[PDB]
């Protein structure tokens with residue numbers, strides 16, 4: 001099975017091609033993770049996936065999506081990850097982390113607590129920052145503050161510090177969250193970036209925050225560990241061919257700047273779009289990026305059907321298959337997939353105290 | 361759905377009728393549990409089951425099955441359970457524990473490391489104790505030492521101390537392991553008990569260790585928390601009707617002595633038997649015990665098919681359905697069962713960070 005072939009990137013070898021993508025839990029307190037996360041992550045690692053990427057972890061308090069988001073904006077926040085990293089490694093999975101800044105989509109309620117911007121007089125909320133003072137709209141009506149050049153320098157340094165902390169906590173894989181309408185994506189998109197300084201206008205200027213942040217992170221992140229990013233390569237906003245062309249060009253610059261793998265997604269920059277949701281719908285776009293930028297990729301959305309994961313890999317659409325919600329439903333999805341695909345000794349996807357009893 | 365109706369016993373209310381029965385993990389060191397158990401148990405509790413019974417936990421070192429078994433023979437061993445109990449409670453499941461003594465089946469290898477008695481010159485092994493100096497046979501050839509009356513008093517006191525420790529660690533449900541050919545079962549069975557003192561011969565004498573141990577435990581175990589036992593009610597050894605009749609009589613004495621629920625199993629006392637394994641094969645025998653002893657029961661073996669669990673409950677064969685291996689395969693089996701049975705808002709079997717995203 002292609003799904004169960006190992007994958008090596010830099011000095012890291014994943015035992016199979018199943019990646020658990022970042023999935024926010026909304027269970028942290030002032031950014032500090034706790035036994036929610038410890039058990040959640042260790043349990044997933046034991047389920048058999050080759051790579052487990054920790055949820056969007058804010059580089060700065062105001063870059064959380066919600067009051068429940070994880071953070072890594074101090075050394076104490078970083079040290080809270082150490083036992084979880086060690087548990088993921090003990091289970092034979094590779095520990096990764098997505099470092100993030102929510103930009104104009106920050107200061108929102110948890111998804112089951114309204115999913116919308118926090119009211120102005122709620123003591124939990126905060127001012128958001130972005131390239132330009134323009135609201136997302138819809139359920140995120142708050143107008144962000146336009147960043148100064150010093151704010152740009154500060155946020156870049158927060159990404160650097162976050163990466164240094166992730167490294168020292170023992171993570172073996174990092175993902176910069178440049179997707180999903182958050183700060184990085186919003187610098188790239190003309191919808192959200194109306195700046196007239198070095199950080200907006202042209203393609204080079206809109207790319208600049210992302211490329212400078214990648215380069216700054218690269219100074220502290222070990223060359224022998226995968227350096228990755230998530231990036232929305234189109235919006236489904238009626239501008240798809242031009243946007244894809246620019247996104248592919250940016251992917252080439254990321255590769256030239258040391259990016260080892262790209263997690264290909266949708267922008268979610270603005271609400272007025274028509275995204276054609278369906279099982280593995282991103283496969284063809286991920287394949288195009290992979291081919292035209294000559295860079296390994298992953299993608300997500302509906303790959304929890306094992307045969308579809310297998311087909312994407314065999315078609316060379318993807319190098320890793322990211323499987324999210326199916327792992328919330330069943331932490332042992334990798335074992336289910338092994339059985340479904342007829343892998344020999346499928347139960348030994350799991351550790352011995354499970355595998356022995358589930359043989360045949 | 362019957363499976364998702366709450367159950368109250370003494371002061372304890374289970375949110376549904378799904379019990380996770382004790383399942384040895386073989387991951388402890390000198391009886392001390394560790395992060396294997398913490399994550400395993402907390403993850404199961406979050407999966408939705410109403411009751412989670414911790415694996416056979418030895419009341420004394422020599423009563424472990426294997427070198428990897430959990431123990432509760434000192435206060436330090438008990439305190440290791442406290443964070444796990446607290447995590448099970450935080451998830452809304454009821455924490456239980458099975459306290460045990462393996463008798464002649466002790467000093468064995470882990471199941472994936474030979475499953476047989478440990479060699480005499482292996483530094484990990486130890487002398488086993490039992491009612492009579494008679495080996496199980498087959499892969500467990502070691503002849504145990506015949507217990508003295510002082511040994512009987514000591515082991516009873518070890519059960520008492522174990523129960524007191526379980527209580528003080530915060531367990532809300534206790535199960536005495538009088539099944540599966542271990543010490544208690546072996547005192548009851550004429551196959552293994554050839555004693556000619558007060559603890560063997562007659563029905564009353566063979567029952568005596570079990571009844572005295574129950575009574576001694578009852579002195580320290582709170583009356584407001586369920587006091588339960590697992591007991592093998594037949595062997596499939598050609599003596600089934602007579603053995604069932606005696607086992608039912610013992611169940612009546614257990615009830616009269618304060619037992620709140622019986623986990624009905626098979627004896628496994630000797631190897632030369634013909635057990636008719638099949639899905640829910642114990643249902644009719646559990647029903648007979650329930651009816652003839654007028655005592656709540658659970659049973660196990662093949663109830664991981666949700667419709668079969670539901671049928672057993674609706675037939676009043678069982679009060680709780682114990683689902684073991686299906687929970688090793690999928691820690692979130694209760695959610696799977698809720699979906700399969702068409703329960704409203706099935707994803708809310710799980711906590712919010714999962715349930716929200718799995719709705720519909």
Ligand SMILES: Cc1cc2nc3c(=O)[nH]c(=O)nc-3n(C[C@H](O)[C@H](O)[C@H](O)COP(=O)(O)O)c2cc1C
Pocket residue numbers: 021022023024025054055056098177179180230300301302303304322323324325326713717
């Ligand atoms: C609970 C939940 C939280 C998510 N949090 C993040 C996140 O932290 N960062 C991110 O890039 N994507 C996030 N996503 C998107 C997932 O990584 C994934 O791309 C998406 O769920 C589609 O894959 P699936 O169909 O296998 O679930 C999240 C999705 C879910 C369901």
Ligand SMILES: Cc1cc2nc3c(=O)[nH]c(=O)nc-3n(C[C@H](O)[C@H](O)[C@H](O)COP(=O)(O)O)c2cc1C
Pocket residue numbers: 353357381382383384385414415416458537539540590660661662663664682683684685686
């Ligand atoms: C891994 C494993 C360990 C077990 N350990 C115990 C135990 O500690 N005590 C016990 O009474 N039964 C033990 N059993 C038996 C289970 O509680 C249960 O009765 C049995 O697995 C049948 O249910 P199932 O078909 O749902 O797995 C164990 C079974 C398994 C699979």
Ligand SMILES: O=c1ccc2cccc(O)c2o1
Pocket residue numbers: 024056065179180
């Ligand atoms: O696509 C998604 C869905 C949910 C989500 C949640 C947090 C962060 C993200 O980046 C997300 O992306």
Ligand SMILES: O=c1ccc2cccc(O)c2o1
Pocket residue numbers: 384416425539540
């Ligand atoms: O039926 C079983 C199967 C496995 C097992 C393991 C340990 C203890 C027990 O009591 C057991 O019972």
